[PDB]
Amino acid sequence: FIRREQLRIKKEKDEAYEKKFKRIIAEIQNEEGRAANEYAREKAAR
Amino acid sequence: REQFNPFQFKTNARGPKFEVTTNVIKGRPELSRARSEEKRRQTILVEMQRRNKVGGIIDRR
Amino acid sequence: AHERRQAKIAEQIRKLEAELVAKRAWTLAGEATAADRPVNSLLGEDMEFDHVGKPVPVVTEEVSES
Amino acid sequence: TIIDNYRDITHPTKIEEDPLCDRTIELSGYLRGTNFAAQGQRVHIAGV
Amino acid sequence: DILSLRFSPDARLLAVALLDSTVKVFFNDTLKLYLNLYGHKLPVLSMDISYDSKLIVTSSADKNIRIWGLDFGDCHKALFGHQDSILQVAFIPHNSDGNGHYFFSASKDRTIKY
Amino acid sequence: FGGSSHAKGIVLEKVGVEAKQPNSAIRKCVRVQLIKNGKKVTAFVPNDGCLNFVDENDEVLLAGFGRDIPGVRFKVVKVSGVGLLALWKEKKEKPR
Amino acid sequence: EFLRFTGHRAFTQRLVLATLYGRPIHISKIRSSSATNPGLAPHEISFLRLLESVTNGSIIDVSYSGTTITYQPGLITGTVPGMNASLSSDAIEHVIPATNTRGITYFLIPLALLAPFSKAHLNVRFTGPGVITSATHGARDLSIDTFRTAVLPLYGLFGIPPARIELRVLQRSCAGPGGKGGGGIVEMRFASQVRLPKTLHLNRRPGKVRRIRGVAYCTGVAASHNNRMITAARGVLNQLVSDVHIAAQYDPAPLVAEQKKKTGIGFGLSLVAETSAEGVIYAADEVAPPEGGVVPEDIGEKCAYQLLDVIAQGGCVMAASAPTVLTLMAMGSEDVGRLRLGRRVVSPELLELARDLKAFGAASWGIRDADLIVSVKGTGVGNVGRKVA
Amino acid sequence: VVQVVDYSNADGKMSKQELKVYLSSRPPDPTRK
Amino acid sequence: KPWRAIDLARLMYDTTLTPAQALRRWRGDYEELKTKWSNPENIDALRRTRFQWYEMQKAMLQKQLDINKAEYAELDEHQRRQVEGYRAGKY
């Protein structure tokens, strides 16, 4: 019983894990690169 | 349905080795697995979840 | 009064000092083999470890019903 | 409070009764941090 | 149009029961709507409430009966038990035998059920 | 950015100390707040055991980024009035 | 074992304050009068198991008579995978037996002003036979969406984020057999904790009450009742104000074991008025008694009238909301917190609560006039165990 | 003179927006409009 | 002499008095409210009567800094002794 429970816990944990981090990485990349390309267009204007 | 799904359970094909008269299911594997699952949950899982939990209620009444 | 509390404390200190100068036991040592550890301390113990494999499927009530 | 002045208050009968006993201490000081409480103030003192 | 109405065995409630497959229960003193029962697809044929007014049975031409409660009027049980349109249903008022919540349902296909 | 070379900030609340691998840039990101506006921007720290020096609500100074979350812009030089490379060569300890 | 209290009044809030300061208490003489059911009550032992479940390191000793408890609090975790649960985000179960009559709001406002002081998220799921999602006749416990649309606004004012409150229902329930029973199940997720709630100033007059919403809910009856409830409360308040609007609800049935029975059947009404200026609202509830059978229009007019009563009464918030917001201002930083109450809104419960503030050493209140202003001296305790990496 | 009563004959339904701001597990804040 | 602020502040923390007795001393069901809000003139009277980020942050915090002492600049014993404790700068 320990075996089936522990390993089910590992599975659920890893799924939540990689989901959480791909969320945060995508949001952060979008924001920082968003304003970065904005600064690119602004400096490129002059 | 009991009689005609008989691989719910396990039975010796012999009958009794000796026939005594003084006045067939010898078990239910699925029910044993069920109830053992229930007990193993209600103890071992909550132990695994409160591995290191300090503090409880002591109640004398 | 304060000296008496301090004396209780100092007896506790020499107890913990005896602990630190003791032989390290078999759980806080790292290398435990059957020669060093006594009879059934596992049976008494509370470890967590790693599991490798796919578990043996269980043919349960509601599964067979499914 | 940085303590400004140390003073001992104890009944001399209690001093002659027990040379080691729960004396009382007056301490003059300034209110330096933020405010005290109204009642139930808890204090630690350096090595005390 | 109303198809059936009754009193309450304690003279406290009255209940009318209409063509619209609906029932409107009021108080006996002033005729203000205590509640209303629905849930039959065909107009009701009869109704009977318990001697202690703790229970309703409401039988309609949908070939079924509804057991309600008289507080909040909740259907305790829908019962589909006659092969035809039940005309009537009746409780016994005397629970002195210990059977007052027993009742007879009489139906167009020549049968009654206890 | 802005109009000056460096800018000041508080660090808001570290993300990515839940980061699994030791040295990934999603450990080495940190969330700073730009004081001159109140903005929330994203800055780097050049080593894990020095992210350990940046603690929440300690004065943090950021600057550009010149060279795996491609295009973060900001990295952090002086922490609380002492430089990061200084602390991490263990020259002078951290005054809060 | 150090602090001493007595009686059985303000049981939950007393444990709340002992919890959120850490001071160890000893409450005596719960029911010295009632020799019928001497000592504790099942909802009390329910909240006790609840606190031990949500916390860590608290220790409760209960007397052989049950008329006296002593209690040291531990610390406030939430849902933690080593101490509490299996995951980080496991949903930890609280079951409460059928011998329960008090509202889960009476359980819930305590968890409400506890959980933003935790270590991590709050993920607690209430199940069981005695779980009532309706307002109680009782000691007049509130109802569920009442609690929502009433007090969660107050956290959103305090700095405790409403969008990261996540409290949902699954099944609903009234009392059923007497006050005993219930059954409907709920889950509260607080993704909303803070260091130190914002010290505020609710002093401007809440003159223009703008809109009124409500919910008529039917745990197992026909929606004729609530449509009539709509039209009745409409006939009441339509003289007053245009924008009155109300959500209907009907839930079929909860089923709990002895072999299961449907229970929790009934219906009731909650109403709230939203104010134009800021988070100022007024809430009232009326339900049918779980064995009564009274008129839904009577419930509509009665809830309407109680709403008008607290409309006339209120300075900033309703008195049922008052302890929550007062305790939050007490937990606030070493500041003054300024709040505008009305004259009538005073309650001996609030008075005794301020007395318990004095008892724990929590500071005092100033009360001057503009209805009155109360300033409350916050302390700045905050959550104790909160990570900064 | 006889007594007669009549039974021979709702706007609280709000809007979908007011549904999704009022019945959800996501509560309405105090500072929105 | 109606129910008053300072009288309430005295009766509030009174270990010799129960909260119920304190409330009745300070001041003086369903059908009653039903009457009181079936009276239409009462409801109509109620109808009438009821219907540079850095420097900005520092400015708001010094609003806080003055609002305390602005709120307990009212009474000596109840506030300056009992609400706000013993203040800094004093001997």
PDB file of C-alpha atoms in Angstrom, chain D residues 10-23:
ATOM      1  CA  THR D  10      12.997  45.940  49.245  1.00  0.00           C
ATOM      2  CA  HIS D  11      11.784  45.859  52.809  1.00  0.00           C
ATOM      3  CA  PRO D  12      14.824  45.503  55.110  1.00  0.00           C
ATOM      4  CA  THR D  13      12.821  42.935  57.060  1.00  0.00           C
ATOM      5  CA  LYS D  14      12.761  40.880  53.860  1.00  0.00           C
ATOM      6  CA  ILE D  15      16.478  41.490  53.356  1.00  0.00           C
ATOM      7  CA  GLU D  16      17.352  40.235  56.845  1.00  0.00           C
ATOM      8  CA  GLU D  17      14.861  37.368  56.454  1.00  0.00           C
ATOM      9  CA  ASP D  18      16.254  36.080  53.163  1.00  0.00           C
ATOM     10  CA  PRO D  19      19.570  37.561  51.960  1.00  0.00           C
ATOM     11  CA  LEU D  20      18.681  35.981  48.594  1.00  0.00           C
ATOM     12  CA  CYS D  21      15.078  36.824  47.717  1.00  0.00           C
ATOM     13  CA  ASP D  22      12.856  38.462  45.131  1.00  0.00           C
ATOM     14  CA  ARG D  23      13.907  42.079  45.536  1.00  0.00           C
TER      15      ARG D  23
END
